[PDB]
């Protein structure tokens, strides 16, 4: 059921957690979020406080240009913010992509 | 990892899929969504078109009064809407609860 439950989260919230892992720094998630404009990023949780890291090296120049025009500039660099701001962070990305 | 990935979806999107099941009608999900105001409901998928069914019989009178004051009235009855409206439906519930 885990695979269809993730499908629901994708249709309901336009977000997909590809996988998780825990390194020395903390617990990390590979995440994509969409609307067709899509953004890929990692969220780290260190113990809590949240680290956001955009995954942009693979994206094409046309792709980067579209995202940059509409998304807030800080979304294209690493960012640290409190856990209590995580849902707003999700909504800001969602509102910017759509 | 499935349990911590669901925890992330909860913190990121303020929603939790308790479980799924498939009956004769289709595929169903028990879902809670929150901000502290919380709403419990089932989403059915019939093949697609979406059926929303609020789960209110257990809630107390004080709880129902708070939700009713702020949430749209149609969220307290069964509702059917196209799959392409599912993310807006999520966002409307999210915006109304917060």
């Amino acid at each position: 059921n885990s695979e269809v439950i993730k499908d629901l989260y994708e249709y309901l919230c336009n977000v997909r957690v590809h996988k998780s892992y825990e390194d020395d720094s903390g617990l990390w998630f590979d995440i994509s979020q969409g609307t067709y404009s899509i953004m890929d990023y990692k969220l780290g949780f260190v113990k809590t406080e949240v680290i956001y890291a955009p995954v942009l090296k693979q994206r094409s120049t046309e792709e980067l240009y579209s995202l940059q025009s509409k998304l807030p500039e800080y979304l294209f660099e690493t960012l640290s913010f409190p856990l209590s701001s995580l849902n707003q962070f999700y909504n800001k990305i969602a509102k910017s992509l759509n | 990892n499935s349990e911590v990935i669901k925890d992330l979806y909860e913190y990121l999107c303020n929603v939790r899929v308790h479980k799924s099941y498939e009956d004769d009608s289709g595929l169903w999900f028990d879902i809670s969504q929150g901000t502290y105001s919380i709403m419990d409901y089932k989403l059915g998928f019939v093949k697609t078109e979406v059926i929303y069914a609020p789960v209110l019989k257990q809630r107390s009178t004080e709880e129902l009064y708070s939700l009713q004051s702020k949430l749209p009235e149609y969220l307290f009855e069964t509702l059917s809407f196209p799959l392409s409206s599912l993310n807006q439906f999520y966002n409307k519930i999210a915006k109304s609860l917060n």
Partner: peptide
Amino acid sequence: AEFTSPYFGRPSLKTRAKQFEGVSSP
């Protein structure tokens, strides 16, 4: 059993997992 169309049939975001191939934590 016969094939049955999935309820969620559109191409998902599962394809994008490959975007994280060579990336490390910051």
